[PDB]
């Protein structure tokens with residue numbers, strides 16, 4: 001599938017499990033429209049967000065709910081969430097993986113784009 | 116100086132200079148209102164964004180214009196911008212430094228609160 | 230298998246392919262003894278370094294040959310290599326993944342340890 | 345001051361204070377010879393390690409004692425230490441800053457050469 005998210009926890013040295021992810025797509029009126037959502041599995045991966053057909057060209061926001069993750073673990077973090085904003089599929093369909101590493105005061109994201 | 120932003124370039128091994136940064140505060144109606152802005156200096160740092168008097172508790176967004184930065188170097192980047200969204204909290208320490216490390220397909224951010 | 234390495238390239242937004250990895254284990258005389266080696270695949274992953282039986286307790290060094298990687302791409306990087314040094318299997322067998330993100334002047338490593 | 349080390353703690357959102365750092369230079373016989381050492385300050389930085397006169401071209405190793413740092417906070421970390429190994433090269437810029445970001449199971453390092 002063309003959009004996947006994988007999250008690691010740098011404190012525990014583990015997949016980040018049960019991380020909620022909401023994806024938005026910029027609409028014609030310039031608002032963020034809800035596009036897809038899900039949560040990471042026991043492997044820290046989130047599969048099945050969308051399909052090739054539905055994942056059209058656009059500007060997408062992948063919101064990773066890092067505060068809700070840290071608060072569900074009873075930890076007080078810094079950030080409200082991690083925001084990944086990117087233009088997708090503007091040269092034809094690609095497959096996008098958003099990889100994230102989380103600590104309470106830091107996060108890091110990288111994109112792996114394949115054709 | 117309660118808020119400082121520092122931006123580094125992981126490709127060239129340098130400060131990220133002349134990067135535009137826009138800070139917003141979340142208003143009561145959930146909209147982002149402009150709060151402060153600037154360009155990073157030769158050291159990749161942006162000082163003097165706000166004062167202790169103006170910088171009250173609440174949710175702030177720091178938007179870093181990474182796309183223009185990369186395109187000026189002739190590099191096509193992945194992100195439209197980098198975003199850092201956080202709550203400022205008078206409990207605990209007073210000075211927030213937001214540090215960003217940039218690559219064309221990656222951004223990392225950490226907070227140093229002292 | 231109990232020791233895996235996965236590497237991403239933050240410049241290209243791709244797996245880091247053909248990255249050489251050498252693993253060492255501290256011997257009784259305190260020298261670094263060669264233990265296993267390999268290179269990342271087209272997926273940026275390196276599987277098959279060792280076995281449960283051979284991967285005994287010890288202090289291991291995973292050397293990721295980042296300079297050779299960047300130089301094979303004709304790019305001049307900063308670091309000679311990335312070094313991951315850790316005690317393994319001291320509470321029983323675990324499975325270790327060393328995840329790395331590379332840029333010419335930076336690198337990042339995280340460990341995912343499962344039981 | 346051609347070489348500076350700065351260390352940050354991603355768990356607490358603070359400088360990593362009183363972290364021991366040992367710098368070595370590679371000798372002709374491939375052994376690591378002591379070169380300079382220190383503890384990070386209250387700002388998490390370590391200044392005054394060397395001078396331009398002593399810091400000649402060659403391969404250097406910066407070893408950061410992250411394991412003691414974490415254990416003093418009551419945290420069992422993954423790494424025995426962090427290592428940064430690099431060639432110092434008079435071609436191009438003169439001042440090397442080695443920045444490290446620490447978590448118990450992760451370390452990241454970037455170089456800023458100006």
Ligand SMILES: O=C(O)c1ccc(-c2ccc(OCCCCOc3ccc(Nc4ccccc4C(=O)O)cc3)cc2)cc1
Pocket residue numbers: 006007008099100101107108109110121123214215216223224225235236237328329330336337338339350352443444445452453454
């Ligand atoms: O004050 C100052 O001057 C100053 C200077 C520099 C600073 C830094 C230094 C280093 C970082 O490092 C950035 C974070 C590290 C990169 O993150 C990632 C590491 C590993 C992976 N890997 C994966 C994660 C999930 C799934 C799969 C992978 C994989 O296959 O590799 C992704 C991102 C950030 C800031 C801070 C302050």
